[model samples]
Target: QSSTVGPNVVVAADGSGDYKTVSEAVAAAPEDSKTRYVIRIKAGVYRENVDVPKKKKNIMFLGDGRTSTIITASKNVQDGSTTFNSATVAAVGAGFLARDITFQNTAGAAKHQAVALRVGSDLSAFYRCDILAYQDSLYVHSNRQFFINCFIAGTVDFIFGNAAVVLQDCDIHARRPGSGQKNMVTAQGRTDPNQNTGIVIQKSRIGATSDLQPVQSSFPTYLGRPWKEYSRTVVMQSSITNVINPAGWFPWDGNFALDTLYYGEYQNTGAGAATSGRVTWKGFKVITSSTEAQGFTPGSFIAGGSWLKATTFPFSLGL
Candidate 1:
């Protein structure tokens, strides 16, 4: 918290610093420090389960780009918790800032459910980060969060959570292997209808990570399903590939909440973006004017404008 990691202390993989591992550095760091602690990770693959507890605030993880710097772990619910509860890198009860890093779970789809990163922090932001995994990759658990210039890859129910999140200029990959027609894309668990918690994929690209033959159905990948009754998710001004099932939204266990959950898409392009067969309850009318889109500004959502600018994070229209 005193200052940046590189200028103050260096934690090399060679076991240099006051401690050897990143956890050691975090342990050595003072708790509740008023200043920010920037951990400058050099190009290296950190093979360990990392978690930033709620007590740690203003922690910044800057990596040497997603290609060179990697954080990998493989933990799943069968190992005893929800996918979000088992993360390779978890930021819980912390206000975190990350840039140019890659968070991944080595467990493939065969592992069932594995999470790459979990953010339960109240006010957190990620910039230029790459989150990789097969299922349940990024868990936006609880908080007001923003993501910019990021790439998230997953196969089923990958980008799911209850937090109020806005993803801007990101590339979202829905990788479905020859698993037949059983894969689902997202399962948002917004507890409150008025909480304003939802996934907003704006100015982004949705593509397939696997071969097109298997997933190329005229059906649409769901925008989201209600993990809770108030679940909400929206895709605006984004590019959705043909891999998306044309139905747009699916029911959760054929529950009645599917009728109440708010799901919509506005002005989305590409073959899969077609709303011809989208569920009437889920498909949205395109908001063409700037005035209509203004409701999506950060200002409209819980101190988003003040904190986002103060944090020096990039602007995400989805907020």
Candidate 2:
């Protein structure tokens, strides 16, 4: 391979690389590899649903940037596909990595439950990537997942899943939803108390897109709503703007998970971080100290320091 391509397999839409499609590059990745297989995806719009199978471990994708390299699909429940089947880009292998790419679903907000990216990869990480969709944009399906400096935007239940997920220095955005529809940032599906699965948004920014700012009050945006009986989530040391509703968390249904789900915020700043107006649900808490939320940090929650050090991505082990 040329020095420009290095040892990595290259995928380009202009046919200038080893493969023309990302799926081809993923398919050619050595199965159950003990080392990372790097795929360099050149700048272009790749309109396809790409999936990395469980056995394709240690696969890494290097993209030109979020705006220049894009992978998109339009599958949704309204079109007869299940929410799980509608992911534009699905990764299931262990140690999967992606940097500077955009995973998107073009299915409009009206077509609910469209997923931009679905990840079930253990020890997986994303850096400087963009996950965009309407509903269920970024699905941390299962296992340990980490994202740093990523941009994730959607409308309702956009960041929903059941994984030990930690997003650091990332941007969580709420766009305009359909009329009468609300915007919720997360829907954690931690079904069991023993499961070490939850979402931790640390040192990030949560706000509305420019399109939603004009009439932001007309459409309430909440931190999250419980997706299951034991759902758990926490946002700490982040900037939450006025786009968020005063009642930070919403209920999945009448009294469901109100007492069992664990929703918390610790030392977050901005107008939306005020806890006085926050829900008084038994499961919600305005965490008073870092010690109370230490278990959710990247180091404690995902053991990120052990494996993530290999990727060289910047991560904070704790508060």
Candidate 3:
């Protein structure tokens, strides 16, 4: 077997060396290469929509943190057929990974349905990354993925998807500004009951971006809704801020398929984390045993076993 290469190739916006833009570096990456190619991006704003296609395997993107370096584009589904449905940053192939980067949609909320990052690639992983937008911020599309020590911020149906995703030690920010009424945080679109498509938030924090005063009435912002029948989501060992409405989960358009969805919570702390008053449909039964949590490990999902070993992706926050 060949030895793995050390470190990464650098890409600066100044047009230095063999490549200037990130797309050029990605285009230059070796096809079907077993060695991981690390692309270290210097601090700057990249104003282009980028895609890491299937041909490029074991690709890693390392940025100068979220505040300084950013990958941004403002495209939505309504823009054009070929444009909006696509993500500002997309990983359509497999064995893709990212760390310390920010994927953003600069289109703003009014533009509607802009996606910051979309991952259709199987066995993908993201660490210490930030995904920011309004509606449809991060799309975990059709894959089993893992995220650790990341920050996600968005408005309506922000973390909606059909992927089986496990988020550990991350921060999920809900931004529902000016809308006086309650808002739904997630609209999970899991289509199959046998498929492992669910959102597992563990040891994380949930806060709101909007400053709207809490209503005395027990109105609640949902933990999630069933975008499709058999949708699933769970929150365990996390903290929820008062911004979250008390009811816990809401129905998608008049509570359709309310009984079919599986939404649960376990060992959560905070004023809004109490499930005593939560709607019966969204209330969760605690999983008291450590053995139970083990079943939901990222490796339990499809293709996870081989993918983790192939990329050497760290399962925990600290590698």
Candidate 4:
């Protein structure tokens, strides 16, 4: 048993730290380490792809801040690699924790499907982080993950996948795409109902971004569409700006699966939170029960009640 406060590895770009790159620190860690090894990174931009392998469990990363520390890369589906291979900072290990860092995909608009951060870890958590990109930024690929007070920028299907992710108190910024393109917030891909996987967004803000060009005000955006047939997503107690489309959710296509998708919302307030004229699909449910909303909360959705308290995060037990 180890604590996540001190430094087991130090990462700096000026050669003053224990390691010059993020990968070097990860390699120095013991394989299948049960004890928590904390990595403290100084303020610098490391232009490389970083991955925490599956065996490297209980790795904690802390940086100066989101603007001060950065991990960037340029790889996308349009270049050559698949969507999963284009991540700048990938956490495939269990019990991963990160705070005050920015993972960015500098692939720009030309390189489509560029992922900034990809998480498939079992019990990973991030706080005050930024995942920046265009098309496919922040890919929550699989397993259970948690995020708080982070900034995520993307365009189409940015926050996609079936990872049973719980994003709380974060800013979901939908970047602008080219002319005649729709902006979508999420694309949950839960293939099976028995998988116990879905997406839960609570106490967050969803809107267009001011940092990018073309100003996302011209185009319409939806909360999500069915990326997979049995996709499930719930947006509860969030604030949404007018950047979203008036109709709310959308389908993949005319022939795509419109039924069997479990999309729900509860007490979300904003110009884009109107559900009176939302999609009339088979799975749109306006959840009013307090018990149901609480079930989708962070501590409950990912079963973080037992372990989340140990992290000492300014968290919520229910929505």
On TM-score, the candidate that comes out on top is 2
lDDT of 3 by residue, 143-193 (tens): 778887899987778887888888888998776532444456787887767
**Candidates ranked by TM-score, best first?**
2, 4, 1, 3
Clashes of 4: 0
Give lDDT for model 1.
0.74
Q: TM-score per candidate, in order? A: 0.89, 0.97, 0.87, 0.95
lDDT of each: 0.74, 0.89, 0.74, 0.85
lDDT by residue (tens digit), candidate 2, 184-227: 89899988889989989999999889999999979998888888
Off by over 4 Å in 1: 1-8, 14-19, 79-82, 210-215, 218-220, 282-292, 316-319
Q: Compared to the true structure, candidate 1 yields what TM-score?
A: 0.89
Cα RMSD (Å) per model?
Answer: 3.1, 1.4, 4.0, 2.4
Error of 3 at 130 (Å): 0.9
Best by lDDT: 2
Order the candidates by lDDT, highest first: 2, 4, 3, 1
Show where candidate 2 strays beyond 4 Å: 1-6
lDDT (tens digit, per residue) of candidate 1 on 149-216:
99988766888888888787888877653355455667888776578677777788888776543645
C-alpha displacement of 254 in model 3, angstroms? 2.7
- Each prediction's number of clashing residue pairs: 8, 0, 2, 0
lDDT of 4 by residue, 54-161 (tens): 999989889988999989889988889999888988899899999999999988876779999899889789999888888888889988888999999888888988
